[PDB]
Write an enzyme that holds these catalytic residues in place. Sequence first.
Site, PDB file in Angstrom:
ATOM      1  NE  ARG A 128       4.479 -10.565  -0.924  1.00  0.00           N
ATOM      2  CZ  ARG A 128       4.087 -10.816   0.122  1.00  0.00           C
ATOM      3  NH1 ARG A 128       4.015 -10.344   0.973  1.00  0.00           N
ATOM      4  NH2 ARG A 128       2.388 -11.902  -0.161  1.00  0.00           N
ATOM      5  NE  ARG A 142       7.993 -18.607 -13.551  1.00  0.00           N
ATOM      6  CZ  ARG A 142       7.592 -18.582 -14.569  1.00  0.00           C
ATOM      7  NH1 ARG A 142       8.679 -18.695 -15.918  1.00  0.00           N
ATOM      8  NH2 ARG A 142       6.100 -17.662 -14.562  1.00  0.00           N
ATOM      9  CG  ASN A 151       1.475 -12.534  -8.790  1.00  0.00           C
ATOM     10  OD1 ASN A 151       0.209 -13.544  -9.160  1.00  0.00           O
ATOM     11  ND2 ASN A 151       1.045 -11.307  -8.495  1.00  0.00           N
ATOM     12  CG  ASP A 196      -2.863  -7.553 -16.250  1.00  0.00           C
ATOM     13  OD1 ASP A 196      -2.636  -7.052 -15.194  1.00  0.00           O
ATOM     14  OD2 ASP A 196      -2.095  -8.832 -15.513  1.00  0.00           O
ATOM     15  CG  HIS A 227      -1.128 -12.968 -13.498  1.00  0.00           C
ATOM     16  ND1 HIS A 227      -1.839 -11.329 -13.962  1.00  0.00           N
ATOM     17  CD2 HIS A 227      -0.330 -12.581 -12.193  1.00  0.00           C
ATOM     18  CE1 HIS A 227      -0.998 -10.620 -13.028  1.00  0.00           C
ATOM     19  NE2 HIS A 227      -0.835 -11.318 -12.025  1.00  0.00           N
ATOM     20  CB  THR A 271      -0.629  -2.906  -6.661  1.00  0.00           C
ATOM     21  OG1 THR A 271      -1.223  -4.467  -6.047  1.00  0.00           O
ATOM     22  CG2 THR A 271       0.007  -2.791  -7.196  1.00  0.00           C
TER      23      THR A 271
HETATM   24  O1  6P3 Z   1      -1.984  -7.274 -10.665  1.00  0.00           O
HETATM   25  C1  6P3 Z   1      -1.446  -6.564  -9.444  1.00  0.00           C
HETATM   26  O2  6P3 Z   1      -1.091  -5.559  -9.179  1.00  0.00           O
HETATM   27  C2  6P3 Z   1      -0.859  -7.599  -8.067  1.00  0.00           C
HETATM   28  C3  6P3 Z   1      -1.393  -8.795  -8.011  1.00  0.00           C
HETATM   29  C4  6P3 Z   1      -1.876  -9.963  -7.179  1.00  0.00           C
HETATM   30  C5  6P3 Z   1      -0.530  -8.701  -6.053  1.00  0.00           C
HETATM   31  C6  6P3 Z   1      -0.800  -9.431  -4.721  1.00  0.00           C
HETATM   32  C7  6P3 Z   1       0.307  -9.629  -3.745  1.00  0.00           C
HETATM   33  C8  6P3 Z   1       0.333 -10.692  -2.617  1.00  0.00           C
HETATM   34  C9  6P3 Z   1      -0.033 -11.445  -2.371  1.00  0.00           C
HETATM   35  C10 6P3 Z   1      -0.723 -11.497  -3.174  1.00  0.00           C
HETATM   36  C11 6P3 Z   1      -1.577 -11.295  -3.889  1.00  0.00           C
HETATM   37  N1  6P3 Z   1      -0.158  -8.297  -5.452  1.00  0.00           N
HETATM   38  C12 6P3 Z   1      -0.438  -7.054  -6.911  1.00  0.00           C
END
Ligand code: 6P3
Lengths: 331, 321, 331, 331
Positions: A98, A105, A137, A165, A192, A247
């Site tokens: 995270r 980045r 991501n 999306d 994305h 999410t």
């Molecule tokens: O667009 C979203 O809502 C979205 C996309 C990927 C992820 C995601 C979060 C943690 C690990 C892997 C994927 N969370 C939310």
Amino acid sequence: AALKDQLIHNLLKEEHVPQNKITVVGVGAVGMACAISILMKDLADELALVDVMEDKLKGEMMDLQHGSLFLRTPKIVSGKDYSVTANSKLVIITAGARQQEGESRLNLVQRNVNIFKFIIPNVVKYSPHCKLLVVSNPVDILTYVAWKISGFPKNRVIGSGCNLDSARFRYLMGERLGVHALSCHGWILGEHGDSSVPVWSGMNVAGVSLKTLHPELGTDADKEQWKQVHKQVVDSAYEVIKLKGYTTWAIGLSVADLAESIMKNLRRVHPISTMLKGLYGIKEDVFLSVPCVLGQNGISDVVKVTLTSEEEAHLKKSADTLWGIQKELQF
Amino acid sequence: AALKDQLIHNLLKEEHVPQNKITVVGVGAVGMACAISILMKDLADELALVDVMEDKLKGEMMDLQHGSLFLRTPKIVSGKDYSVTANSKLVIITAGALVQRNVNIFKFIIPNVVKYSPHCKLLVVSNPVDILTYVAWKISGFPKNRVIGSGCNLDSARFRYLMGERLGVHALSCHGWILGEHGDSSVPVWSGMNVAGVSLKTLHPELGTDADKEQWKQVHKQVVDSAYEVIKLKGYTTWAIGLSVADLAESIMKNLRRVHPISTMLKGLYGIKEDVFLSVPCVLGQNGISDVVKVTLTSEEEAHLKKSADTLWGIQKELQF
Amino acid sequence: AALKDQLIHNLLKEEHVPQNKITVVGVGAVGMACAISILMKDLADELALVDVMEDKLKGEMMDLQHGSLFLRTPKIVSGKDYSVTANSKLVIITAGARQQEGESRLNLVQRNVNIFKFIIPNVVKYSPHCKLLVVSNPVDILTYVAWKISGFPKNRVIGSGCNLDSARFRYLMGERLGVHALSCHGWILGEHGDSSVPVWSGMNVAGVSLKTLHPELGTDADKEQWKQVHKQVVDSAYEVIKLKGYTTWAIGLSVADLAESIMKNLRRVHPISTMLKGLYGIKEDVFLSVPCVLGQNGISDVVKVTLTSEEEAHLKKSADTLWGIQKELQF
Amino acid sequence: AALKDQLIHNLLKEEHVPQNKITVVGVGAVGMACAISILMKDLADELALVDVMEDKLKGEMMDLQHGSLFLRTPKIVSGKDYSVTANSKLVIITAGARQQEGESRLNLVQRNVNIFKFIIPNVVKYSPHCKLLVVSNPVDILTYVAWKISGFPKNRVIGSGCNLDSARFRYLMGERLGVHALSCHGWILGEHGDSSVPVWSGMNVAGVSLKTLHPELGTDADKEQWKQVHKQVVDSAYEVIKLKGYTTWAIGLSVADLAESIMKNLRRVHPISTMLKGLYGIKEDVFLSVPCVLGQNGISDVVKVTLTSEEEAHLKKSADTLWGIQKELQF
Ligand SMILES: O=C(O)c1ccc(-c2ccccc2)nc1
Ligand SMILES: O=C(O)c1ccc(-c2ccccc2)nc1
Ligand SMILES: O=C(O)c1ccc(-c2ccccc2)nc1
Ligand SMILES: O=C(O)c1ccc(-c2ccccc2)nc1
């Protein structure tokens, strides 16, 4: 003498080999959402979970197993050792780091690369023939990293990319129009996130092009501000993270849908991230979301959407960005 | 005109009266597991979520809404105000904090529920579930057939899974009932455990006793402990409880009249004389619990149920509504 | 440039191999009921149909294909040539002759053997590793025929046997008790048809033995005449045939349920017909229905039901009768 | 004490009313395909069948009931007497008179009208608030007849219309392009049958207009002959009947999918026949297929498709021919 043997006469030894096994890598909230969605749609005859946090992992497995009476997936397993993932048809990668604050980045990506250098070889070693589906991501970059590390041909390495999306866009579209998202069609392509491209020329209900009805559609000269919906889509995930912390449900359902096309070889078209050097005017080794035919051999074909020169330019810009970043990674 | 009106000619003044609406009260891990399991089983044409934590609540709603493309439940709503729950067929209670405290909480939730869905069935999952089902029942004013506790439903499912592991067959084919008070005091009905109509107890009379060389008694213990073991590992449980609840939702919404080990007001039966809820095998359909199976119990299985009743009533005596 | 190639860019060369292919042999009403039920349960990624009636076969295939929009089985094929069945996991035999006026039942059986002498070698040739599920009547005898002709190990040759009849018994049980069939348990074992055995001692709801509650259960001295419930089961096919000329829907649903256990490796216990020489006091190579654990390798174990002396006698008599007919067949 | 009362203690003395009841009128091959498809999609808590052939009717009811163990629809009823259909949410009409010869069209229709004069009053008597779904041919005319006889508001009287033919079209489309029908979009509208209207402009994959890649699409000059694909749709029912004697499965699946939109209030858009006076340039009381929003109140909204002048006049002509026949009907 033993009760099992008193009750049950055994006639056949074990040859036990999974026929439609799916592994999910990472049991954070996204990983487990993918898992429950996959279990409840009967896509696999075996599910494997892997993660580095061993207590959390065992707990999640057990909870799922206690639900067995209510599922049609007879075998759920887990472990830190990737031998539990062996002979998977599909392996879904949701693990990652995270972004900390100040991180930058390029630095976030590299740390994810470092995790994949551990994950990917372990996946490939035990499932040489699987499809890889990356959800972590930033997906477009990390799908590239998994492709390069795994050595897999491009048809077998998929990024969830813009799939959810596009699903969110169809949902908001349906809300404005008063019909179900299933009957509303719109495509978001490219990189994305905020750089993704809403293809206005393709948005329609029942084959009726909204742009042909409403020429201003998508521009800033639009009293109805339909351009906002794309931004709504992009913003809505961070809105949700701000509200519940993360999410899960939507992305899990999104991933299960893709898994269905793969496991059942449906050859449906999804907006997902594929290595598209050679198409859409792209010259570098880059993954972007385009409408892909998805089936038991991964991505077999790509729809060539007709884009405006602006839209084509957007894809080029993202290709440069993505490539410029990948050029600076340590593999 | 507006793009919508250029695209769509409206022919009817639409009235939205939900026909198969379900409400989940509480969007903790349990409530949301119920929600997603219910959504994926196509049980409702509308889902309402309610909780006091407004941000969390709106977030969970939006997250589910975003999956609409992949579901067959056209409307999902939420709010702290109970108007959103109006006209539900079934309202599932996962909120809670003791007991007199839960009474105080339910003293707000339940009348709010009854106000907006006067004819709904109530399904209580909150622990201690047998007592809180009684609480929800008293406050609701509903007849007993319409107020149901998840009771021993999950623990039976756990028992059946562990039975399957030991025997090498799916839980669906392994039958076994855990009844009575949910939790440590529940009753493993050894006499009913069977595959294909073959009593395990008849094959192996030691089944469930201390002298049992296979220690089947430990299986029930493992069931009673499993929530605790899971919480210790991941911090809570969710998936299995949510699946088990969606299964009860299914029998109700589709009027299946399947038999489930759930908690029902059983005064008048099994020798019980007080107003208490215990798990027995219940016939479950569109009118809730309309019938219960009368399990033939050993004299000490019976005394174990009567004891749980006196235990529950002893607590219930104190509370004030 | 063809429209297809204008629209879609191909990235892969498919060599298509079905992963969860099922074949149904015989497109009579019973076969098409199996087919539609299997399609609506998403059990296969490819369905193949074979029959000697070429027009009827093509018509059924096309009818099913026109429904593809509403199904999740991407590929439906057919032909009189068994190459269309290649690499099936599961092959379901519903083909048969119907008696004429006329011919004895034994002569009718032999004509079905001759039909199986053609079908079974063709099935085995193109799907050496499949499981066989035989539905054609008389099913215990024809399953033995398929076993013998095929050369398959017994675990892979399954008769639908008393599966539907037990389902019928549970439904009639549930009508009498006011409870759904899913919660009423009871087993019809042995030889499919008139000689089948209602195991009274096993009948229960929530694990409460009916027989213990009502010791008269299933006896002549029974004032509630539960034996008549078994008689209804034995007669129900005949009764439906008098009304509509044949049965289809229920047998099709009961076959799809067996198919589910197999394709998903569930190891559920089903009352199906298996080669049970050596068990249940049986000394001959005959197939009888007993509770079988059914999974991806077919029947891996059987449950040993405790039978009364009179029940064991009925089974042995059935084994004698079956074996007697089997010696008279020309292979 | 009866065994039932020993086993079960009744706590509630309650009544009847089914909450999601569906009735199918006519147990021919079409009605039964509708029924099995509805049963296997879990769309109803009660299913009623009605037909004038009493033995056939009872036979089909029994056959379905025997499959209860495998279904989640607890009550299946039948009767020549319409009280069995009481309180249906949705009633599906598949009964009608057949074709003989010397069609004074307003005869093999006026005869269907005389048949409906019996069915529809009975239906509305026991289900005053149901939705009516007519499948019987000719569907646009018979949906008008049921509408007139019932007294229902137009939103509640629906014809299957071009729903299956569009599905067939999308299937053939998928075959040509190498992708699943779910991802192939196209609409056939207007008068069901030879005179239906292929809306070339709306055909697409992922929002890419085929007509725009390929302007000749649909014309006689089309080197790829896509016009023949529409003709292939119009003929397909006739081709299947020629081969197997009737069609069933595809129509049944398509009808169950309409039933899903209704029972779950999905508000999806389907190409079905709706009373479209006042829209699309039409002024008579006729039913034509256009894209309709279908929900718990039937058809509440219609999509206004952008038609070429040629397409418009084609719909206008269909309206006039339908009215021309309806004028001559005695109610
Ligand atoms: O667009 C979203 O809502 C979205 C996309 C990927 C992820 C995601 C979060 C943690 C690990 C892997 C994927 N969370 C939310
Ligand atoms: O037995 C379990 O695992 C179990 C049962 C109930 C609950 C539960 C927890 C909070 C609110 C409502 C219900 N959690 C776990
Ligand atoms: O018990 C029944 O209803 C039943 C069982 C098998 C069959 C059957 C008929 C023809 C070919 C294959 C199987 N028909 C009816
Ligand atoms: O287009 C078709 O295949 C089609 C449509 C309707 C029907 C149909 C036939 C009899 C009664 C009701 C409906 N058959 C075939």
